[PDB]
PDB file of all heavy atoms in Angstrom:
ATOM      1  N   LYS B 105      96.570 102.658  49.140  1.00  2.00           N
ATOM      2  CA  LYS B 105      96.670 102.072  47.698  1.00  2.00           C
ATOM      3  C   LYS B 105      97.607 102.959  46.876  1.00  2.00           C
ATOM      4  O   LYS B 105      98.420 102.393  46.090  1.00  2.00           O
ATOM      5  CB  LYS B 105      95.298 101.925  46.998  1.00  2.00           C
ATOM      6  CG  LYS B 105      95.393 101.197  45.619  1.00  2.00           C
ATOM      7  CD  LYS B 105      93.971 100.985  45.129  1.00  2.00           C
ATOM      8  CE  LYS B 105      93.139 102.205  45.086  1.00  2.00           C
ATOM      9  NZ  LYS B 105      91.769 102.118  44.495  1.00  2.00           N
ATOM     10  N   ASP B 106      97.578 104.245  46.969  1.00  2.00           N
ATOM     11  CA  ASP B 106      98.487 105.085  46.424  1.00  2.00           C
ATOM     12  C   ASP B 106      99.697 105.551  47.203  1.00  2.00           C
ATOM     13  O   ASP B 106     100.018 106.742  47.256  1.00  2.00           O
ATOM     14  CB  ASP B 106      97.802 106.335  45.786  1.00  2.00           C
ATOM     15  CG  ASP B 106      96.977 106.998  46.836  1.00  2.00           C
ATOM     16  OD1 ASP B 106      96.778 106.519  48.021  1.00  2.00           O
ATOM     17  OD2 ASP B 106      96.386 108.104  46.703  1.00  2.00           O
ATOM     18  N   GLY B 107     100.288 104.600  47.853  1.00  2.00           N
ATOM     19  CA  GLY B 107     101.624 104.724  48.523  1.00  2.00           C
ATOM     20  C   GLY B 107     101.672 105.888  49.565  1.00  2.00           C
ATOM     21  O   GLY B 107     102.738 106.709  49.600  1.00  2.00           O
ATOM     22  N   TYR B 108     100.720 105.985  50.441  1.00  2.00           N
ATOM     23  CA  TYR B 108     100.798 106.836  51.587  1.00  2.00           C
ATOM     24  C   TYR B 108     101.147 106.126  52.876  1.00  2.00           C
ATOM     25  O   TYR B 108     100.384 105.023  53.127  1.00  2.00           O
ATOM     26  CB  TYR B 108      99.572 107.709  51.773  1.00  2.00           C
ATOM     27  CG  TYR B 108      99.539 108.897  50.827  1.00  2.00           C
ATOM     28  CD1 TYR B 108      98.964 108.995  49.623  1.00  2.00           C
ATOM     29  CD2 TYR B 108      99.970 110.169  51.463  1.00  2.00           C
ATOM     30  CE1 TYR B 108      98.889 110.135  48.969  1.00  2.00           C
ATOM     31  CE2 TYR B 108      99.870 111.419  50.766  1.00  2.00           C
ATOM     32  CZ  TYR B 108      99.413 111.308  49.447  1.00  2.00           C
ATOM     33  OH  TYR B 108      99.303 112.512  48.729  1.00  2.00           O
ATOM     34  N   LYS B 109     101.954 106.581  53.729  1.00  2.00           N
ATOM     35  CA  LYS B 109     102.286 105.939  55.070  1.00  2.00           C
ATOM     36  C   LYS B 109     101.518 106.655  56.071  1.00  2.00           C
ATOM     37  O   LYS B 109     101.618 107.916  56.288  1.00  2.00           O
ATOM     38  CB  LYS B 109     103.760 105.914  55.227  1.00  2.00           C
ATOM     39  CG  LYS B 109     104.644 105.392  54.161  1.00  2.00           C
ATOM     40  CD  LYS B 109     104.463 103.857  53.981  1.00  2.00           C
ATOM     41  CE  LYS B 109     105.312 103.215  52.922  1.00  2.00           C
ATOM     42  NZ  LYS B 109     105.133 101.814  52.818  1.00  2.00           N
ATOM     43  N   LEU B 110     100.766 105.808  56.912  1.00  2.00           N
ATOM     44  CA  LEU B 110      99.945 106.441  57.916  1.00  2.00           C
ATOM     45  C   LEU B 110     100.081 105.625  59.188  1.00  2.00           C
ATOM     46  O   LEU B 110     100.404 104.402  59.140  1.00  2.00           O
ATOM     47  CB  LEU B 110      98.488 106.440  57.552  1.00  2.00           C
ATOM     48  CG  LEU B 110      97.807 107.678  56.773  1.00  2.00           C
ATOM     49  CD1 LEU B 110      98.560 107.873  55.440  1.00  2.00           C
ATOM     50  CD2 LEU B 110      96.341 107.404  56.545  1.00  2.00           C
ATOM     51  N   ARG B 111      99.753 106.285  60.351  1.00  2.00           N
ATOM     52  CA  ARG B 111      99.609 105.608  61.634  1.00  2.00           C
ATOM     53  C   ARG B 111      98.216 105.929  62.123  1.00  2.00           C
ATOM     54  O   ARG B 111      97.835 107.134  62.186  1.00  2.00           O
ATOM     55  CB  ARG B 111     100.767 105.912  62.606  1.00  2.00           C
ATOM     56  CG  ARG B 111     100.691 105.105  63.800  1.00  2.00           C
ATOM     57  CD  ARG B 111     101.801 105.339  64.767  1.00  2.00           C
ATOM     58  NE  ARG B 111     103.171 104.931  64.178  1.00  2.00           N
ATOM     59  CZ  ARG B 111     104.174 105.681  64.107  1.00  2.00           C
ATOM     60  NH1 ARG B 111     104.210 106.893  64.479  1.00  2.00           N
ATOM     61  NH2 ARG B 111     105.187 105.179  63.422  1.00  2.00           N
ATOM     62  N   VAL B 112      97.400 104.823  62.507  1.00  2.00           N
ATOM     63  CA  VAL B 112      96.059 104.907  62.866  1.00  2.00           C
ATOM     64  C   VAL B 112      95.829 104.320  64.208  1.00  2.00           C
ATOM     65  O   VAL B 112      96.177 103.188  64.566  1.00  2.00           O
ATOM     66  CB  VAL B 112      95.187 104.236  61.741  1.00  2.00           C
ATOM     67  CG1 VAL B 112      93.754 104.259  62.280  1.00  2.00           C
ATOM     68  CG2 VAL B 112      95.515 104.827  60.524  1.00  2.00           C
ATOM     69  N   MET B 113      95.138 105.143  65.162  1.00  2.00           N
ATOM     70  CA  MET B 113      94.748 104.698  66.494  1.00  2.00           C
ATOM     71  C   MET B 113      93.269 104.517  66.543  1.00  2.00           C
ATOM     72  O   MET B 113      92.559 105.522  66.331  1.00  2.00           O
ATOM     73  CB  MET B 113      95.294 105.715  67.428  1.00  2.00           C
ATOM     74  CG  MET B 113      96.763 105.967  67.547  1.00  2.00           C
ATOM     75  SD  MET B 113      97.424 106.847  66.175  1.00  2.00           S
ATOM     76  CE  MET B 113      99.200 107.088  66.676  1.00  2.00           C
ATOM     77  N   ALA B 114      92.835 103.354  66.976  1.00  2.00           N
ATOM     78  CA  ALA B 114      91.343 103.042  67.068  1.00  2.00           C
ATOM     79  C   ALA B 114      91.130 102.642  68.574  1.00  2.00           C
ATOM     80  O   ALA B 114      92.001 102.423  69.339  1.00  2.00           O
ATOM     81  CB  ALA B 114      91.027 101.870  66.236  1.00  2.00           C
ATOM     82  N   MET B 115      89.862 102.789  68.952  1.00  2.00           N
ATOM     83  CA  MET B 115      89.395 102.502  70.296  1.00  2.00           C
ATOM     84  C   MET B 115      88.032 101.984  70.289  1.00  2.00           C
ATOM     85  O   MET B 115      87.147 102.382  69.558  1.00  2.00           O
ATOM     86  CB  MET B 115      89.483 103.868  71.151  1.00  2.00           C
ATOM     87  CG  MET B 115      89.398 103.620  72.595  1.00  2.00           C
ATOM     88  SD  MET B 115      89.714 105.071  73.598  1.00  2.00           S
ATOM     89  CE  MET B 115      88.154 105.747  73.831  1.00  2.00           C
ATOM     90  N   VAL B 116      87.888 101.053  71.263  1.00  2.00           N
ATOM     91  CA  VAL B 116      86.564 100.418  71.578  1.00  2.00           C
ATOM     92  C   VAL B 116      86.286 100.405  73.123  1.00  2.00           C
ATOM     93  O   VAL B 116      87.218 100.167  73.771  1.00  2.00           O
ATOM     94  CB  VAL B 116      86.512  98.839  70.982  1.00  2.00           C
ATOM     95  CG1 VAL B 116      85.364  98.197  71.491  1.00  2.00           C
ATOM     96  CG2 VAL B 116      86.529  98.960  69.447  1.00  2.00           C
ATOM     97  N   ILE B 117      85.141 100.678  73.494  1.00  2.00           N
ATOM     98  CA  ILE B 117      84.651 100.647  74.884  1.00  2.00           C
ATOM     99  C   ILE B 117      83.645  99.538  74.996  1.00  2.00           C
ATOM    100  O   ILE B 117      82.661  99.552  74.339  1.00  2.00           O
ATOM    101  CB  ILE B 117      84.091 102.037  75.351  1.00  2.00           C
ATOM    102  CG1 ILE B 117      85.098 103.131  75.101  1.00  2.00           C
ATOM    103  CG2 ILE B 117      83.695 101.926  76.772  1.00  2.00           C
ATOM    104  CD1 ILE B 117      86.231 103.216  76.130  1.00  2.00           C
TER     105      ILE B 117
END
Side-chain angles (χ1 to χ4, degrees):
Chain B
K105 189 172 54 180
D106 52 353
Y108 274 90
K109 306 293 184 175
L110 273 59
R111 190 172 293 123
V112 178
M113 298 72 169
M115 196 170 88
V116 169
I117 304 282

